[PDB]
Design a protein around this ligand. Structure first.
Ligand code: FES
Ligand SMILES: [Mg+2]
Ligand SMILES: [Mg+2]
Ligand SMILES: [Mg+2]
Ligand SMILES: [Mg+2]
Ligand SMILES: [Mg+2]
Ligand SMILES: [Mg+2]
Lengths: 58, 96, 137, 85, 122, 99
RNA sequence: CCCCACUAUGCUUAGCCCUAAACCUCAACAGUUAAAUCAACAAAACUGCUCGCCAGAACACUACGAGCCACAGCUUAAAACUCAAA
């Protein structure tokens, strides 16, 4: 448990932790963006509202 | 009466019904090269009709032929025969 | 040529080699990844055992055995022993869907063994024996 | 009784073991082997199996129909042409 | 009826294979079958290892015997092939050419089912 | 000697066309929203096509374009619906301009 | 309930037992979508014909009687006391 010898691996672990935190933040940003999916659930719900299903007669 | 009125008749523009690739062709358990086209290369699983594209009758014929070949020593069960890996890909499935 | 994910077939002439050895001669690393344990045995192509390492053999006990960390440690130990015995490239054959299914493999890569192929040998009966009854949770 | 290193085998490309394992898992998933193993861990009684199969078939029908409707209507996601009226 | 015996024989030299085929066809004739053709599919590695008569076979010679036999002779021939040692595996099927292929017009599309639920407002 | 409706329908170009799938028609752009072109090709419903990357500025209001019709109206009945859901537009592929 | 081990049992053969939320709780046959469609929910409303069944709840898949290879059983199956509900 001597940090002086382990400096390289300690730095690697710290960099991985920082990358993981920044990637979680970027993933939240991407989810707000919605680029990965074909469309966000909100916009899809709006689209389905525009063209509702009609299981009844009128 | 009136000549320009419509006439009752069959749909002339009706396209012919789509035929499965194996329509009109005999499926035989000895034709391991053909049966191997409808099995998974890695697991030997028989592909569903949504993958093969065959009709119900030809799908059942392929299934029974594959089972008969597997049980009678003509076809491997757990994998696709390597000799038939380069045969035409007639199954709508991509793994990569 | 184009890389093919399908393994080369024994009895066929294949230009692929690994340290001058054919695919039929590369040693085999069997990774049984149970739900509570992960065992890794390295054997020669001629079926000669060379190394063995499990989460239990690494000093992990009880629920700690069935973790990715324990499997990775076991993989590192097994890879170290195999490299001591002269093994470089391995064909990985994994059976079971335990937590250590993949991490153990990583351990081997961390140990210094190159994985040329990965094979799943999880025992899937075609409706043979009857497994135990469902738990109530 | 079969030959070995043919079934469920994926060759690693330039030591990309991560991608090779991902491809192997995708193959097992698409062929349904993973779900089969998970369901075969504990015995599923025939009534429970029938109920699960019925539920999954109804789910497949609903999901495919919803996907078809979404794809059909996606063209109508374009900009509003009569804005202000 | 018309049967097809698919036969996998132990990989042997030509005299032994000829003797085995002659013995099998003679047995078929003795049981009453009229043999019409004997088709050789060649010798090939078996798809999987077969253990027959305390011997593991990796290669086998594949043959077909098309014949017309009375229904009662099939069971006796199956027993005879089971007792034989030179036969890795023998299976008698009904001849595939007997079953005529009915003409298929094409894949008739299946329309979406309708009126499965009442049109009352929900 | 007044022409009847049946006579008009029988000799109408839309009737003479037959099925609209893979038929080349001449449409006129009547509305543009950014890169979306709303083209009327004489059918009941207009089509909406993306402005092509090549000669994008060449597409303006009143432009005559060559379309390849795929369907006069986009309708499909979905799970549980009692009537076909229609988007009130046709399906056509914009090839280019006609001179 | 969770974990481990094992037995009756699950399997074969020869007899029994004859019960299930044995329910798709939606009878068989023929026909209609016309309307006056339609309590509610469910899986739309109906017509002709026939058979079987039902008539407040609980007592009650109970008692007695009877029949059965069944003997702590199964089928048929009440009544009295009680309540204004179920
Ligand atoms: S398409 Fe003709 S039998 Fe299947
Ligand atoms: Mg227990
Ligand atoms: Mg059995
Ligand atoms: Mg039932
Ligand atoms: Mg009872
Ligand atoms: Mg009683
Ligand atoms: Mg009594």
């Amino acid at each position: 448990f001597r940090d002086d010898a382990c400096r390289k691996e300690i730095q690697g672990f710290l960099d991985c932790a920082a990358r993981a935190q920044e990637a979680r933040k970027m993933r939240s940003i991407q989810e707000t963006l919605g680029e990965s999916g074909s469309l966000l659930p909100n916009k899809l719900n709006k689209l389905l509202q525009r063209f509702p299903n009609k299981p009844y007669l009128s | 009466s009136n000549e320009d009125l419509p006439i009752s008749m069959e749909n002339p523009y009706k396209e012919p019904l789509k035929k499965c690739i194996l329509c009109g062709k005999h499926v035989d358990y000895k034709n391991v090269q053909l049966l191997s086209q409808f099995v998974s290369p890695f697991t030997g699983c028989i592909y569903g009709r949504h993958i093969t594209g065959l009709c119900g009758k030809k799908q059942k014929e392929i299934t029974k032929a594959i089972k008969r070949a597997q049980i009678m020593g003509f076809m491997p069960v757990t994998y696709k025969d390597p000799a038939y890996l380069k045969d035409p890909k007639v199954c709508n499935i991509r793994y990569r | 040529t184009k890389f093919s994910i399908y393994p080369p077939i024994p009895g066929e002439e294949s230009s692929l080699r690994w340290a001058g050895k054919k695919f039929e001669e590369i040693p085999i690393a069997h990774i049984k990844a149970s739900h509570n344990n992960t065992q890794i045995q390295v054997v020669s192509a001629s079926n000669e055992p060379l190394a063995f390492a499990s989460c239990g053999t690494e000093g992990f006990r009880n629920a700690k055995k069935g973790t990715g960390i324990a499997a990775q440690t076991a993989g590192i130990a097994a890879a170290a022993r195999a490299k001591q015995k002269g093994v470089i490239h391995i064909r990985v054959v994994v059976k079971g869907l335990g937590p250590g299914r993949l991490s153990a493999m990583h351990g081997l890569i961390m140990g210094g063994l190159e994985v040329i192929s990965i094979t799943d040998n999880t025992p899937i009966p075609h409706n043979g024996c009857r497994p135990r009854k469902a738990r109530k949770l | 009784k079969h030959l070995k290193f043919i079934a469920r085998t994926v060759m690693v490309q330039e030591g990309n073991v991560e991608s090779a394992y991902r491809t192997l898992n995708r193959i097992l998933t698409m062929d349904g082997l993973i779900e089969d193993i998970k369901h075969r861990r504990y015995y599923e009684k025939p009534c429970r199996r029938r109920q699960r199969e019925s539920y999954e078939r109804c789910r497949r029908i609903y999901n495919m129909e919803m996907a078809r409707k979404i794809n059909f209507l996606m063209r109508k996601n374009r900009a509003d042409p009569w804005q202000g009226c | 009826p018309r049967y097809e015996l698919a036969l996998i024989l132990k990989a042997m030299q030509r005299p032994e294979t000829a003797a085995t085929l002659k013995r099998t066809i003679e047995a078929l004739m003795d049981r009453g079958a009229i043999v019409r053709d004997l088709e050789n599919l060649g010798e090939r590695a078996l798809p999987y290892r077969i253990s027959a008569h305390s011997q593991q076979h990796n290669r086998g010679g594949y043959f077909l015997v098309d014949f017309y036999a009375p229904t009662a002779a099939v069971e006796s021939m199956v027993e005879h092939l089971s007792r034989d040692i030179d036969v890795i595996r023998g299976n008698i099927v009904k001849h595939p050419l007997t079953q005529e292929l009915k003409e298929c017009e094409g894949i008739v599309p299946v329309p979406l089912a309708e009126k499965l639920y009442s049109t009352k407002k929900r | 000697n007044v022409e009847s409706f049946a006579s008009m329908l029988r000799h109408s170009p839309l009737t003479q066309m037959g099925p609209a799938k893979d038929k080349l028609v001449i449409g006129r752009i009547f509305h543009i929203v950014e890169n979306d072109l709303y083209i009327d090709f004489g059918g009941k419903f207009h089509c909406v096509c993306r402005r092509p990357e090549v000669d994008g500025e060449k597409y303006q209001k009143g432009t005559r374009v060559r379309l390849r019709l795929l369907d006069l109206e986009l309708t499909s009945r979905f799970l549980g619906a009692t009537t076909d859901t229609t988007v009130l537009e046709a399906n056509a592929v914009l090839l280019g301009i006609q001179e």
